[PDB]
Every structure is written in structure tokens, then in C-alpha cells.
Amino acid sequence: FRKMAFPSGKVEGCMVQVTCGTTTLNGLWLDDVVYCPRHVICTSEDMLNPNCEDLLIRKSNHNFLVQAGNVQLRVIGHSMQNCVLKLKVDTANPKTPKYKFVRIQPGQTFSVLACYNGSPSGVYQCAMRPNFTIKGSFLNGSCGSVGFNIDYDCVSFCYMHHMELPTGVHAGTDLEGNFYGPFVDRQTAQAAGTDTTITVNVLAWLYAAVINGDRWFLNRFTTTLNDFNLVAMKYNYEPLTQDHVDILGPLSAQTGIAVLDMCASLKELLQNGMNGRTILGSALLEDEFTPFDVVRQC
Amino acid sequence: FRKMAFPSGKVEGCMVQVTCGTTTLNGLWLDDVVYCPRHVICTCEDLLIRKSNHNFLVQAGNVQLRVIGHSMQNCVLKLKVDTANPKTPKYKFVRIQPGQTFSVLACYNGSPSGVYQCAMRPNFTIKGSFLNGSCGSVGFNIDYDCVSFCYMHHMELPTGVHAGTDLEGNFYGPFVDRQTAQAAGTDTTITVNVLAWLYAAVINGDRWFLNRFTTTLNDFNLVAMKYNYEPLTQDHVDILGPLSAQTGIAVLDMCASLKELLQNGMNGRTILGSALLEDEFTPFDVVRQCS
Numbered sequence: 104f105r106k107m108a109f110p111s112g113k114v115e116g117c118m119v120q121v122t123c124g125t126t127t128l129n130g131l132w133l134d135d136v137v138y139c140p141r142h143v144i145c146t147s148e149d150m151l152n153p154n155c156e157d158l159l160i161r162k163s164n165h166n167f168l169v170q171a172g173n174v175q176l177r178v179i180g181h182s183m184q185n186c187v188l189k190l191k192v193d194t195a196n197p198k199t200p201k202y203k204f205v206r207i208q209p210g211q212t213f214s215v216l217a218c219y220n221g222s223p224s225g226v227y228q229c230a231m232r233p234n235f236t237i238k239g240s241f242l243n244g245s246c247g248s249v250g251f252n253i254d255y256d257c258v259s260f261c262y263m264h265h266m267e268l269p270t271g272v273h274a275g276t277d278l279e280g281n282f283y284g285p286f287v288d289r290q291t292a293q294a295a296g297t298d299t300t301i302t303v304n305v306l307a308w309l310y311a312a313v314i315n316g317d318r319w320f321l322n323r324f325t326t327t328l329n330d331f332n333l334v335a336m337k338y339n340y341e342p343l344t345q346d347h348v349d350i351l352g353p354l355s356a357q358t359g360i361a362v363l364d365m366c367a368s369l370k371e372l373l374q375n376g377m378n379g380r381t382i383l384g385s386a387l388l389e390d391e392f393t394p395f396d397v398v399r400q401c
Numbered sequence: 402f403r404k405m406a407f408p409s410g411k412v413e414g415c416m417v418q419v420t421c422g423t424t425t426l427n428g429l430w431l432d433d434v435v436y437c438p439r440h441v442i443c444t445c446e447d448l449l450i451r452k453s454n455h456n457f458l459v460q461a462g463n464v465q466l467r468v469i470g471h472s473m474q475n476c477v478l479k480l481k482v483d484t485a486n487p488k489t490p491k492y493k494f495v496r497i498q499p500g501q502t503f504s505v506l507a508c509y510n511g512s513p514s515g516v517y518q519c520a521m522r523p524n525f526t527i528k529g530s531f532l533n534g535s536c537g538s539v540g541f542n543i544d545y546d547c548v549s550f551c552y553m554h555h556m557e558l559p560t561g562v563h564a565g566t567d568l569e570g571n572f573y574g575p576f577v578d579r580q581t582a583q584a585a586g587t588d589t590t591i592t593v594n595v596l597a598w599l600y601a602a603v604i605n606g607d608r609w610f611l612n613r614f615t616t617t618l619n620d621f622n623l624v625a626m627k628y629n630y631e632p633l634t635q636d637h638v639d640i641l642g643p644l645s646a647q648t649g650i651a652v653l654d655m656c657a658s659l660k661e662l663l664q665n666g667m668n669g670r671t672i673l674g675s676a677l678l679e680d681e682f683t684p685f686d687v688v689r690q691c692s
């Protein structure tokens with residue numbers, strides 16, 4: 104199994120740069136609107152004490168330099184939606200793909216297109232941690248890079264990049280500007296909640312092992328969801344939701360292993376350890392492959 | 402620090418579907434030529450002379466391109482079409498060296514499916530992710546809007562690793578394009594890349610494996626060969642200079658850390674979240690991402 108990103112071309116065609124004053128970040132150009140982090144308007148003396156909504160009153164359309172490459176897009180309007188700025192431009196992007204804005208749940212994966220000054224630099228897959236951080240690879244100037252999924256040529260944008268935490272993980276918003284997790288867009292050292300293991304993805308990993316014939320961990324036990332969830336928390340595993348049970352349905356049907364039977368198999372692995380054995384060639388359980396990712400590769 | 406592929410858009414615009422008889426795979430459309438694995442004509446030289454232009458159905462999305470000529474170059478078929486691809490990037494064909502990395506755009510039925518980074522192994526396989534119908538997917542690097550194509554996909558070995566050709570149709574490794582079970586040579590670990598990745602781990606604040614000891618180059622190499630690692634050359638030492646300059650760790654100091662890692666193991670600890678020594682990041686891969 105590889106971490107595979109989605110092909111990035113439909114998003115590459117949407118990346119622009121937005122400069123206000125001396126600060127440049129990335130923006131997302133869809134139809135005649137450019138989306139970018141609102142703190143592009145911030146000076147060095149703000150950022151610590153964000154006056155963003157009031158800072159915006161002093162700004163006008165002619166203060167924003169939006170560029171596709173070095174071609175300027177004239178801004179004809181602007182507004183703030185939570186932590187994102189929306190700049191109306193006078194040109195509809197001809198490369199606009201079919202798209203949606205979606206808010207993802209912890210455990211879900213998405214492709215990040217890392218960009219600097221409007222120019223795409225690389226692509227890689229990320230997983231939203233239960234503490235609403237991602238293990239990105241972002242440098243100075245990355246803000247406004249986006250994360251996305253592609254289903255039947257429709258691009259679901261789910262992430263825009265804002266911040267690196269002191270611990271080196273990353274935090275951001277959806278495309279309506281609402282942060283994932285308890286972070287704010289201030290120049291300020293913030294702490295995430297203690298992370299946990301993504302149980303639904305570990306289960307998907309065990310299904311992937313079964314599909315490939317590695318199934319020694321299957322047992323003759325089952326569990327209720329409540330009993331499992333209470334044991335899971337004692338090992339710093341996430342509790343399962345009904346939605347988690349539901350997205351494991353296709354893999355359960357494919358292997359003939361009930362979800363609750365697979366939970367009981369994981370419960371044993373958690374209480375008794377791996378006994379030095381391996382699963383898919385590893386003593387470590389992987390929790391960054393979703394059920395959809397597993398069927399994608401199998 | 403993450404395994405990072407190049408943005409695939411310039412390549413996606415070149416992928417097409419090629420069908421001949423009951424066989425369908427992917428092709429690469431550059432200017433007015435489509436490049437694809439020659440065995441698209443199989444259900445090859447006597448078999449190709451018996452084919453006509455119209456036996457080939459080439460599709461770019463919905464539109465069909467008209468084949469007006471064809472030639473074979475080694476294991477690649479070159480189909481001349483009557484339409485030029487307007488999205489053709491500036492490009493080059495290159496044959497990569499073992500240990501170098503590239504991005505793969507896995508495609509099915511002419512449609513791009515996923516992108517990920519691979520290394521050309523010392524035994525000239527690659528550890529990819531390819532299914533039925535992935536043949537003709539390509540590997541590439543991007544340098545200032547210029548796409549260097551280096552790989553076209555042909556085969557999956559019984560061990561699950563993969564084999565293919567350069568864009569001249571010459572295989573990497575001792576493989577042939579036949580429906581047979583083929584074994585590769587014994588693989589080794591790319592030493593210069595493991596060292597690059599250990600430097601990456603230092604740049605990202607991971608230091609538990611550093612030590613005070615040092616080693617000579619020959620003594621390191623004696624241990625390296627013992628653990629089935631490739632020799633480290635003075636040119637590799639030179640190539641690691643910048644990363645040594647940034648971190649202030651001499652290359653042979655890092656070699657001493659790798660030697661102890663090899664003789665002692667990691668003791669359950671991890672490096673950049675990995676429990677295994679990683680050898681698919683080149684020194685350039687570390688540099689271009691960390692700066």
C-alpha cells in the first residue's frame with residue numbers, strides 16, 4: 104500500500120497569488136471569486152492582536168493585487184467569511200472544475216497541493232487527526248494552499264492552510280473559513296488536544312490485510328459497539344461513530360467479516376499486543392488509510 | 402517532512418487511451434505522437450507489420466484521434482496522429498540512474514487515477530501501486546516547467562514490485578515484455594538516500610540516533626556491504642555537503658550514526674514516524690522540500 108494523492112491538475116488551474124501590502128499568499132480562483140486567508144491584510148503589528156474585521160474596513164478593492172502568474176486580475180469586490188477573504192474579480196476562471204466545498208471529519212484523508220506565490224510545488228496525502236491537525240509539509244509562504252478529494256471529476260475542497268503549531272503539525276480551515284479544531288488565526292503559539300488513534304482507519308487496515316490473505320488476528324469473538332468504545336478509549340483509540348460503522352460496510356461485505364467481529368479482533372490486539380507477529384508486514388498498525396482509500400488500492 | 406510528488410497537471414493533459422483488439426492501456430500524447438507499450442498489439446515485429454493504422458483506437462477523453470502512421474522503438478510503440486496535443490509541455494526523455502526518484506501518475510483507461518513518488522531501486526525495479534490496465538502510465542520529474550519523462554509502466558513481478566522501460570522502450574533491469582514470471586536481482590539499500598533522510602530528520606528536530614563517534618569512509622563501507630547497503634562514494638559525500646553544512650554534522654559523523662543503527666537497530670524508536678530506515682528520498686528531495 105502507498106499513500107497516493109489525487110491527480111492535482113484540476114486544482115493547479117485554480118491557484119493564484121494574492122498580495123496586500125507586502126504579504127503574498129496563495130488564493131483559490133473559482134468562477135469569478137478568489138478565496139484566500141483573511142490575514143493577508145495583516146501587518147507585522149497586527150497578527151498578534153488580530154483586528155481583522157476592523158482592519159478590513161480600511162481596505163478597498165484597489166488594495167488587493169491578485170495575479171495568475173504575473174497577469175493581474177482586477178478585484179471588483181471583497182468580503183470576509185469567517186477566516187477567509189473572498190475577492191470578486193472581473194474574470195471567470197476558464198479552468199474552473201466542477202467543485203463543491205465540504206467540511207471533513209477526523210480520520211478522513213485528502214490531497215494537499217503545496218503552493219508558494221501561486222505556483223504549485225508538490226502534492227501529497229494527509230489525514231485529519233482526531234485533534235484536528237494534519238502532518239503537513241509547509242514552509243513560509245504556504246498559506247492558502249488547499250486540500251481536496253476528487254470523485255468523478257468533481258473536486259471537493261476541504262482544507263485551506265493557515266498555521267503551523269509549535270509541535271510541527273498544521274492547522275487550517277474549510278473553504279468557508281471555519282477552523283478545524285480550537286485554533287484561531289493569530290500569531291500565537293497554540294496547543295492541540297492530545298491526539299488519539301483513528302480507530303475506523305485501523306479497522307480498514309485490518310480489512311485490507313484480510314483481503315490480501317493476512318488474517319491470523321481474526322477470532323471467534325464479537326462485541327457490542329459500546330463495550331468496544333469503552334475499551335478503545337483506555338488504549339487512546341478513538342470511539343467509533345455510527346457513521347464509522349457505516350463506511351466500513353463495503354469492506355465488511357467484501358470479506359464477510361462483520362464490523363463488530365472485526366472490532367472484537369482489534370480489541371484483542373489492543374489488550375494482548377502483537378506477540379511479535381506482523382500485519383501486512385508490520386508490527387505497527389496504520390491509521391491513515393480510510394475505508395475508501397483501501398478499496399481505491401485493492 | 403513528507404514523501405511528495407510533483408504536481409501532475411502537465412502530465413495529465415498528455416494521457417490518452419489506446420486500444421487494439423481486446424487490449425486497452427494508456428498512452429502518452431506529445432505533439433503529434435502517442436507513445437505506448439508495444440504489447441498493446443498482443444492478445445512483436447511480425448505482429449506489427451500485420452497491423453493497419455485503423456486497428457488502433459486512440460481516445461483523448463471523448464474525442465478520437467486518427468492514427469496516420471506507426472513505428473516500434475524497442476518495447477514502445479510510437480503512433481503518429483493527425484492532431485497535435487496543444488497541452489504538450491516542454492519535455493525531455495531521460496533514463497534515470499538507480500537511486501533517483503520520480504513521480505508516477507497511475508492511469509486507467511486513459512484517465513489519471515493517483516500520483517505518488519517512487520525510486521528506481523538498485524535492482525532496477527520500482528515499488529509502485531499498479532493494477533490491471535495501468536500499463537502505459539508514466540514516471541517523471543519536473544524542472545522549471547520542463548517535464549523529464551523517465552518511466553513507462555509494463556509489468557508486475559510475482560513479488561509485487563514493478564518493471565518498465567524508459568521512453569525509448571528499453572527496460573530498466575533484466576526484464577522482458579512477456580507474460581512470464583520473472584525474478585529480479587537481489588535488491589540493496591540506497592545508502593546515500595538513507596543518510597539524506599537522517600539529515601532530514603535532524604532538520605525536523607529528531608536527534609536520538611546521533612552519537613559522538615566518527616568513522617572512516619572505507620570502514621563505513623565495510624559495514625554497509627555487510628548489511629546489503631550500496632557503497633557510499635566520495636561523490637555521494639560531496640552531494641551531501643549542503644545538508645552537512647546546514648546541520649553542522651559531518652558526513653562521516655552521520656555515517657557513524659547509520660553504522661550503529663545497522664548494528665543495534667532502533668530499539669522500537671522511530672525516525673520521522675518511520676520504524677524502518679527509509680531509502681527513497683534523494684539528497685535533492687530533502688533539499689527542495691526543507692528550503
Ligand SMILES: COc1cccc2[nH]c(C(=O)N[C@@H](CC(C)C)C(=O)N[C@@H](C[C@@H]3CCNC3=O)C(=O)c3nc4ccccc4s3)cc12
Binds near residue numbers: 142242244288289
Ligand atoms: C508566536 O507565534 C507563534 C509561535 C509558535 C508557533 C507559531 N505558528 C504560527 C503561525 O503559523 N502563524 C501563521 C500566521 C497566522 C496569522 C495565522 C503563519 O505563519 N502561517 C504561514 C504558514 C506557516 C509558515 C511556516 N509553515 C507554516 O505552515 C502562512 O502561510 C502565512 N504567512 C503569513 C505572513 C504574513 C501574514 C499572514 C500570513 S499567513 C505563529 C506562531
Ligand SMILES: COc1cccc2[nH]c(C(=O)N[C@@H](CC(C)C)C(=O)N[C@@H](C[C@@H]3CCNC3=O)C(=O)c3nc4ccccc4s3)cc12
Binds near residue numbers: 556
Ligand atoms: C505467467 O505470467 C506471469 C506470471 C507471474 C507474474 C506476471 N506478471 C505479469 C505481467 O506483469 N504482465 C504484463 C503484460 C506483459 C505482456 C508485459 C501486465 O499484465 N502489465 C499490466 C500491468 C500489470 C497488471 C497487474 N499490475 C501490474 O502492474 C498492463 O497494464 C498490461 N496488461 C496487458 C494485458 C494484455 C496485453 C498487454 C498488456 S500490458 C505476467 C506474469
